[PDB]
Amino acid sequence: VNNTKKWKMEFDTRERWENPLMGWASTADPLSNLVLTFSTKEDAIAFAEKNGWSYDVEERKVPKPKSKSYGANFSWNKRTRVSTK
Amino acid sequence: PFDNTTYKNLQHHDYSTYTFLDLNLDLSKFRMPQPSSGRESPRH
């Protein structure tokens, strides 16, 4: 999960087309590889507003806390018995 | 008379392949009713 720690700013992907000579991916987008790293959401929003970029923000999706019990694998009367191990 | 010279466990010379399971079938009538988990299996 170490790649889910920081905020990122990317841009909308523009056209990539086939190079007629070699088949390479040609682009005319200068911002196609620009990925910026931010510690918080507000730093990224301030940097986008400072540069006149129209932005959209997705909230951080954290995994919710799970209830883990190894003994639940071997319950007396619940469906959470494992059939194998 | 006290005997300490013969091996008294000579019954297992006459055990067949279904001796254990026929003994379990004989013992099935002596036993208490089993407890229930309330469902037919953990996949029910």
CA distance A57 to B2: 96
CB neighbourhood size of A9 (10 A): 18
CA distance A9 to A58: 11
In angstroms, the separation between the Cα of residue A64 and the nearest Cα of chain B is 27
Contact B42 A75 (CB under 8 A): yes
Q: Which two tokens stand for residue A20?
A: 């007629």
Resolution expressed in Å: 2.3
At residue A18, what is the residue type?
Answer: E
**Every domain of chain A and the residues it spans:** 1-85
In angstroms, the separation between the Cα of residue B44 and the nearest Cα of chain A is 7
CA distance B34 to A80: 22
CB neighbourhood size of A27 (10 A): 14
For residue A51, CA distances in Å to A45, A46, B14 come to 10, 9, 95
Say if CB A85 and CB A73 are below 8 A apart: yes
CA distance B44 to B37: 11
Helices (H), B1-44: 19-27
CA distance A5 to A10: 16
At residue B19, what is the residue type?
Answer: T
Interface membership of B9 toward A (CB under 8 Å): no
Say if CB A27 and CB A14 are below 8 A apart: yes
For residue B19, CA distances in Å to A66, B9, B14 come to 51, 16, 9
CA distance A84 to B43: 13
Contact A83 B43 (CB under 8 A): yes
Q: Is B5 left (phi over 0), alpha (psi -120 to 50) or beta?
A: alpha
